[PDB]
Design a binder for these strands. Sequence first.
DNA 1: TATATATATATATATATATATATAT
DNA 2: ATATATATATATATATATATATATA
Lengths: 273, 273, 442, 442
Amino acid sequence: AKVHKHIKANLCGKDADTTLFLTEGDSAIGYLIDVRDKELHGGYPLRGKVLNSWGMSYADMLKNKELFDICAITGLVLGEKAFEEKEDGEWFTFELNGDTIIVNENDEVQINGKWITVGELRKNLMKFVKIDSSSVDMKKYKLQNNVRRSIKSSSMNYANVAIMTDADHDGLGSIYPSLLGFFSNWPELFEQGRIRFVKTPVIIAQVGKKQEWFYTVAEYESAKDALPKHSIRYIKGLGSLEKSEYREMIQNPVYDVVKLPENWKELFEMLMG
Amino acid sequence: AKVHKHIKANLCGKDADTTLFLTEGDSAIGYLIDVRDKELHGGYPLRGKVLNSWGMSYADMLKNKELFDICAITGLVLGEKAFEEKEDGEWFTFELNGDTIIVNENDEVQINGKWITVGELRKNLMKFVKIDSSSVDMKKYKLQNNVRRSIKSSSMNYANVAIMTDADHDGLGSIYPSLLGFFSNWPELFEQGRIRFVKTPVIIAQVGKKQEWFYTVAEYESAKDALPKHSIRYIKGLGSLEKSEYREMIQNPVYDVVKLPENWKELFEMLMG
Amino acid sequence: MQLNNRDLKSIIDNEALAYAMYTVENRAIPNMIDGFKPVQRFVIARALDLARGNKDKFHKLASIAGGVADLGYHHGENSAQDAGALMANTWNNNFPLLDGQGNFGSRTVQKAAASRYIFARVSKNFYNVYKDTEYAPVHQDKEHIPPAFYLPIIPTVLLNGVSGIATGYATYILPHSVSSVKKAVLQALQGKKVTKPKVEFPEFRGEVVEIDGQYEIRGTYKFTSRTQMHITEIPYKYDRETYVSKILDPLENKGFITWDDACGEHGFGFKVKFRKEYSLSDNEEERHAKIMKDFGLIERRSQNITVINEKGKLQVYDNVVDLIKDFVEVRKTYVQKRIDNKIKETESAFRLAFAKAHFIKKVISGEIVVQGKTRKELTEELSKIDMYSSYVDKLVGMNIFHMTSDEAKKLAEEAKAKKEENEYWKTTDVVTEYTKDLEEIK
Amino acid sequence: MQLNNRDLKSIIDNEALAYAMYTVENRAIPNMIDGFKPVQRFVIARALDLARGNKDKFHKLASIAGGVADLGYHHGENSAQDAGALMANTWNNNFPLLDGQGNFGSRTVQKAAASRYIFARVSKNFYNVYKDTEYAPVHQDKEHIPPAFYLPIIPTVLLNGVSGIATGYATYILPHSVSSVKKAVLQALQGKKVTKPKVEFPEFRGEVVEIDGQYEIRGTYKFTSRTQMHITEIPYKYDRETYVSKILDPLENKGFITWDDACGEHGFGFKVKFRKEYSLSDNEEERHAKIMKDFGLIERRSQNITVINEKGKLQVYDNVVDLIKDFVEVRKTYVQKRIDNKIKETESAFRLAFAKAHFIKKVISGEIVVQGKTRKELTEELSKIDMYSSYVDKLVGMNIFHMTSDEAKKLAEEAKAKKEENEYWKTTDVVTEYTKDLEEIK
DNA sequence: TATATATATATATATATATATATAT
DNA sequence: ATATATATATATATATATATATATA
């Protein structure tokens, strides 16, 4: 079918790094419309806190409008794997930035914020060491955050999902960790870091005509004196941002790519209750 | 039984000029306790909004706690006359302040804010003219607002009821019209001028060490120029009255004694219906 | 102990009369002069109170809306919040009087952020037009701290575009261009025939035409193939939430078209693909009419000018021309009042400056010796000369450097400047001053 | 595009470390120094902001509570309303910090009117005892406009009586008489042994006795006959709503007694007549004990001094004596800070006044001629003299009457007065000043 | 092609004491 | 008499203009 509040991307459902933004509130979605690019960035507004998704039946979560639309837009379905990885093949080891890295012939490498295929790196005159599969350290292979397997077939409409919430709602209620608890039902998103969270700056300091963004108060207090004559404004939420800063934050984003720890299931029964 | 929030007067239930104050809110009942005459004045707080009761259905409107408590305190019971008037006897006429007034040997006359028995006036060297009952104009007698029949037997606990509401709660819903609609069930109270209303000043002007009270804004606007240097306070409710002013308004009250017109049964439908 | 005899008619009527004064400050009918509904007037007064000191400081909308209850606004804080949010944007106003810092919405999505996040302040437009505020009428209610109305130089009631429905009355005015309104005001002021000010909507790229009095508000579009067209504008009454859900979604449900979103920084946009089921008319005019009707590109708006005039009554105007004429008359009266008070003020200022210059020029030569005497001795002595009557407290009591040679001339210069200002404000009419104020609305 | 790899543990730690900062600015634990809970601190700061211009004006409680959100109070305005309402009365406070105009309650009925009706202002007690508020510590959170704590000269945490129940901690302090607290503070200042300050509840005519640390707060009564008794006081924990509904209601329900109300302008009162079914013990001590237990006239209160130090930590004291000692130490440091800043400020002021007097003397004599010297030609001439190093901006620029004979002597008198003030501030210690500020409380 | 601050600089005015005075205790 | 509660005159830190440099589409 279709979702009303959802704003589709031009290449949504195709092979591109299309992102879906889960804005908190219906107001920020207008800024998203104005500043996004039509090809990649999607969008969907969340009005309030999404209901808890921990220890509940799939029908119960499917009752919620927001969760149902999230599943519809993302192409995600509860209880089924988000995507199927490519079959394991020849293993190759190389030295990247002085560090030994073990990958397959069908893996993705995170270099300078961009994911590069193994075939592209091979075509880039980079030395590759063929290693037998039985003589490969799987524990070290799975510990590398910059290595992820390439997806053969995926039902996901969007490559990534970005969360974008107010900065004064992190503990006085919660909208972010509830979304994380819902997304935890597909761990493969976190294992490749699909689920992300853009960092809305906490303090925006206008140094003359330029702008400097501080993502925590401590950073600003440390850098307050070294800065020149400037004025600051506490960005207590997305609505406190102007359109130009919203564009500078969407087109040039910084992502808190969340990682699931070894016991994330136990850690989620802490704030849910 | 016993009413909880009711503050029983010492002479309540006797043949004394008692009074009950249906104050709006539970906060001003403390000021009433501090300033009331323990012998005569009673008290009861009204902590809500329009009391309806114009829809009748005695049982349905006895569900309301405030109405039931008012009935218990005042001694009023719905569907029964509040008091039984004295039997008609000999009629007398006298010239009161140059006005011919026809009364009967057992009424009461309102002189200078006080109600005096017919026998007391006769004993006060006042000329009385005996007139046959068949020759007495009942239409003229009913129109006299300064003459009221003496009560033979009364079930009322209080000789009067004094309403006491905020000036900010006028027009935007109130209890004064609602209490009026409830008290209309016993028109004999209004015929004798029993149900009253304490006029809270709208503007209190501190002229030096003295005080002048203006019960309408127009009165102050007309009289402000002739006043000396002063500061005024907009009394938007009983809560804004200090205890000294509350005592000066309780011990020296000004009463808007409600009188039912010839069509009271019809005038209460246009507001509440 | 008094016993008055209220008769339940003075009770009921007074109770109903108090519900009247409570609804004459909430009626959604703009004042004819300042174009302000009472809530907007309170919001503007509060934002002017907060703009004391730094006029460019953005105050929280929550603070602006919370401060209106102390100015005499007896309704909720949410009303002031919404009034500020709607005033502070640019999509909804052809001439906004509140500035904005945050998400105040757009034509695409007409919802502002939470009032705690968005900041606002009175814009330069307000200070451009809204002048003579010190001469604004004082309200009859002494708890109404804002005046009866403000005094813009042009009828701001037409610029931004009002729409309100009251108890038994309704107003509807279409947003007019600032340039056309100013030209009409100038024509009315100078006595020329007034041309009807043209209607333009803020941040609107379409076209508006007038037939049978009603305004046809049409959105533009362009074709790129036999089945592909690009909708590049829609009528001002739409937003992406309702245009998609009232036109494009029904057409998709009927299988007529397939569309994708194209809304961007510039405005609206919906590229449309046509299917075989959607019949295409050979005639170009029939096809254009079918497109304009099926796709909701045509909006007809009827203007109902119901404006509270200067006297405080409800006046309904036939056309905006007479509104501009009567507004120009009453604002002419107020500009004349300002002219008179400024005459009387600048005369006193000029004479004070002349006395100061004379005193300085005399103490330079030592005519009025200040040494060897007391302050109480000098005050009475200066009170003897005719020119120093109420200025002695300001004559001996001004700084020492005035008794130099350079600053002894800057006082004569200011005396001459104040004489020139007296001449300018006492030889000119309301016409000239209203014209001069009209040439600063760029 | 940056791709950081924050883990879920960091997410949970940072989210939890904002509910540990949202419940610490709302911790119901009074500060050691000012005795203010944070909501009361915000209310006091707001009432001080409103008291600028007219300290005696009564501001609406709704306005006071609505202005606290702009000072950094992130909780509801109802909290500020209730804090002001409980803070602005005299029945609940030995030393109330807010004044009150309206119905703020009483011991009989302990609820104030609506916040729109009652007005409040900072009382003379606050200005009398809260000094050095310009040296109060600046809060670490820059959105916390009020300081870290205010600076009373006596531990106001004891005067009014606090009771805070929090998660994992609870505080309970009993109201101490202002005179006893002042005497204890003076003893701690001089260095003498501190006597235990006696507990004195406000507007309480009963008696309080200390046994095993716990306090027996007993009401008083008087007998008028063999079966008629008059309750002339009840323990401070009661109000007429709960005294009747907890003690007198069961007593009249079991047929023991019949009572009538006797309250009024003099606190509480309940005339009681007994019945035959209520046996009266012949022994006087047994009768008194059974009356005290039956009529709820005795209550036991345990003191739990949990306060927040100047370091921001939670401190628990066994007895108020050590509270007095530590408060005296920290306030002693702050009085030293005031001593030093006042020393430097009066020194600068004395130098400025001496320069002013010298300039006036020389221009009266004629040594410095201000005639015909322009503006930027006498200024640099004054800059050459050592006494006029940085004072020329204030030295030429003071009014002309200073150059007469009367004010020439008046300037030297102020120079000598400022020199004497500097000597005074550089001769005394914290002991002398903290003492002198202590005799101005009554 | 104008813009826009923008930085000292005046200013006059709304304050926070200091103190004269009629006053209740 | 005893503060004390008001009226009243004073330096001073803003709010308001007061001049004028600084630059983005």
